[PDB]
From Swiss-Prot, chain D:
InterPro entries, per database record: DNA-dir_RNA_pol-M_15_CS, Rpa12/Rpb9/Rpc10/TFS, Zn_ribbon_RPB9, Zn_ribbon_RPB9_C, Znf_TFIIS
Compartments, as annotated in UniProt: Nucleus, Nucleolus
Protein name, entry field: DNA-directed RNA polymerase II subunit RPB9
Span of zinc fingers (TFIIS-type): 71-113
From Swiss-Prot, chain E:
Shown chain mapped onto the complete sequence: 5 to 180 of 517
Annotated function: TFIIF is a general transcription initiation factor that binds to RNA polymerase II and helps to recruit it to the initiation complex in collaboration with TFIIB. It promotes transcription elongation.
Top-level division of the source organism's lineage: Eukaryota
Post-translational modification: Phosphorylated on Ser and other residues by TAF1 and casein kinase II-like kinases.
Subunit: Heterodimer of an alpha and a beta subunit. Interacts with GTF2F2, CTDP1, TAF6/TAFII80 and URI1. Interacts with GTF2B (via C-terminus and preferentially via acetylated form); this interaction prevents binding of GTF2B to GTF2F2.
Name of the gene this protein is made from: GTF2F1
Organism this protein belongs to: Homo sapiens
Identification of the protein by name: General transcription factor IIF subunit 1
Top-level taxonomy: Eukaryota, Metazoa, Chordata, Craniata, Vertebrata
Induction, as annotated: Up-regulated in response to enterovirus 71 (EV71) infection.
Modified residues (Phosphothreonine): T114
From Swiss-Prot, chain G:
Physiological role: TFIIF is a general transcription initiation factor that binds to RNA polymerase II and helps to recruit it to the initiation complex in collaboration with TFIIB.
Subunit structure: Heterodimer of an alpha and a beta subunit. Interacts with HTATSF1 and GPBP1. Interacts with URI1. Interacts with GTF2B (via N-terminus); this interaction is inhibited in presence of GTF2F1.
Modified positions (N6-acetyllysine) in chain numbering: K21, K32, K121
Residue ranges of coiled coil: none
Full-protein interval shown: 2 to 150 of 249
Compartments reported by the entry: Nucleus
One BP annotation, GO: transcription elongation by RNA polymerase II
Positions bearing N-acetylalanine: A1
Post-translational modification Phosphoserine, affected residues: S126
Organism: Homo sapiens
Protein name: General transcription factor IIF subunit 2
GO MF term set: DNA binding; RNA polymerase II general transcription initiation factor activity
Key words of the record: Acetylation, DNA-binding, Nucleus, Phosphoprotein, Transcription, Transcription regulation
Family to which this protein belongs: Belongs to the TFIIF beta subunit family.
Signal peptide: none
Amino acid sequence: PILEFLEEWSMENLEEISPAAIADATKIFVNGCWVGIHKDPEQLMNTLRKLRRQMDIIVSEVSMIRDIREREIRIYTDAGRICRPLLIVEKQKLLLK
Amino acid sequence: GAKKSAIGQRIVATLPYIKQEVPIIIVFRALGFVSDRDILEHIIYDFEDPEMMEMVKPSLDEAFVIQEQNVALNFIGSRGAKPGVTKEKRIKYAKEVLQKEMLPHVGVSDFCETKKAYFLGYMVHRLLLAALGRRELDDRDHYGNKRLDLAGPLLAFLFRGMFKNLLKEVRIYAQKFIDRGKDFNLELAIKTRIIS
Amino acid sequence: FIQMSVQRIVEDAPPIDLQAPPRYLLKFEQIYLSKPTHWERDGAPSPMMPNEARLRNLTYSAPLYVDITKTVIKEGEEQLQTQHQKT
Amino acid sequence: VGIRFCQECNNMLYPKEDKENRILLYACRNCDYQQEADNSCIYVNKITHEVDELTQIIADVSQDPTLPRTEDHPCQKCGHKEAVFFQSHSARAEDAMRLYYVCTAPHCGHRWTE
Amino acid sequence: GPSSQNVTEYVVRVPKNTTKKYNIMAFNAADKVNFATWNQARLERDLSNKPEDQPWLLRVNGKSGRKFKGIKKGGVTENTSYYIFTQCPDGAFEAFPVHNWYNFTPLARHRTLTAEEAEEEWERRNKVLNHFSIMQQR
Amino acid sequence: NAEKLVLRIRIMNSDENKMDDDVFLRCIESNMLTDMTL
Amino acid sequence: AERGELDLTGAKQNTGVWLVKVPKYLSQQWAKASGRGEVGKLRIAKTQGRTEVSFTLNEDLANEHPFVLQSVGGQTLTVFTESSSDKLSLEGIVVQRAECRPAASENYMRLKRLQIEESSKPVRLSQQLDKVVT
Ligand SMILES: [Zn+2]
Ligand SMILES: [Zn+2]
């Protein structure tokens, strides 16, 4: 489901791109596999975060990591990842009311 | 050395089921990327960076002799754990090693060479950044680099080994009866004690 | 592991191909698990409670069954496909 | 510094000298191809390597919520008061305490160091 | 003028079947591929494996011209489809699904070192002199 | 006096008048950087 | 002129074609009938200094698809076809690339969820068995 959604959104597959485009774009990794590149990493993370929080396509235990400096988005779905629940804060306010 | 320190530091790859490592550029040659520009395009994504380009110069010189994909595959096959009797078989063995044994998570299909070249180039690209000091070395202790094998995954590890024995056992049992000329009973072929 | 990994492991196993020349194939498709059962001396199955396993030094194990489809070809333009349900 | 690739087989071009004219030529290997060199420098390495970090810095870092933000260093390019400051923290420097600032205004990835 | 605000709308047609299949041919930008000199070309399946499940070999202008090898895209478009719009006299766009995607790269032609020859150079791989001279001797 | 200190090096004239005229400088350059002791 | 010869006439005419990436549901609806000769209309609107591409789904087919263009200077693409009579030809050269996106955002995921569930039907899972097999 993650790969299908990523393909639907403005993510270019590795096969269907020229290497000259990889410089500016951010690499997209899913379970350590470089799926493709994306030209708007910030919007993608907002969309990816929104889906997980709504539990639409992305399950709760899926972790999305963006390395802003390295221009990489790492999505991990495998088992064995240790996680804990944290309250979401938006605009210096708790979403918990 | 006189020429050892002139070329600089070269990058090699330790692929599975190969006794000795191979030059990195050779692996790219085997994957189907012959020209230097095509190989470097998978390693250096910004040609305007002279620092990165120099780091790969010694690697290119090391694999300069090998200039064709078949030549590179033979070199990889020649160093295989089971060297082929003839040159043709060596190429087939090397192709199988890269097809399945090398970076299997990237893919195992016959047309996944391009994907494996990009990731292999990314592995080289990551190595260059560490060598150039642009990226900090990974921390083994960092706990996000760790995974916990719970009861399930641990049990799944055993089941495949025990299920392979079960499938091997039925193959052996059936082969005896098929060679004898008589059909075999499936219920009798299965050894239930293997999994239990 | 029980719901997914065991079934995936069985599904991902390659079909067993055997050649004599009659040819034989074995394909495992569906995996079934029964509740933890204990077989008495007479051979009568009965549900095994965890306390009974603890008291009688038994293993709390569930029987595992797999649907196996066998196809045989005898180079006589005939194919016989027999399935052993819950092996 | 410039790296040149052959126009025939897209392979590396290495420096070569022609005694007939005594002019640097970048000659392809295994391709009997030659090119007229113009840089005149074939190799250069900087041991000190005082490479500017601002070139390495990526403007996208301004979106990092873990970086500190200061209103006391307005952006020169656009005047935006807010800025995100950090240290290079990259090996080979041996002294990484100076702060590099990146403007937080969207579309203005101006980077500067005080 | 009209071009400053021109609006164009055309009908879309999807024929059920076509005698000729449609596939994408991709050339890298650095290749600088030019079709002006492509007087003649040959496209056929490879013979190295020795059919429908094998790579495609492209030859241009016989042996004299450049040779390209096409490889099927390993990544499948299970959730994606590709269509091509071609101008027609009737003025309605026509969309054809992409049966296959092929990536073509140029193949250099020259006296490439053979496998047997590479064995001798492996001895001097660590220590070699005048990289240019190695090709001259061959 | 110049803000930059420079030292131009060239191979002997007798040899000019066998390994390689270009690579040899790299071997010298790498050799002089580390092996040579000031 | 031979069997392996490629009819490069399309390249000579410099015919231009557009490469479009569309989702499966749009193509699936087309694949439903796939023989009526009509699936929709492609509308392109141009302004003084901006161009927009959009596609409208046929009313019968249903019982907005904005298009985003992409740069094609980074890679050169050509389209060729193989005739059933062993006569390969080059249709033309790609001059522009476009992608299709869904107008809706919330309820659109509902259709995707059904597809993910639908593609999950072949995903076999172990079944609990009330009575031990005898
Ligand atoms: Zn060349
Ligand atoms: Zn600013």
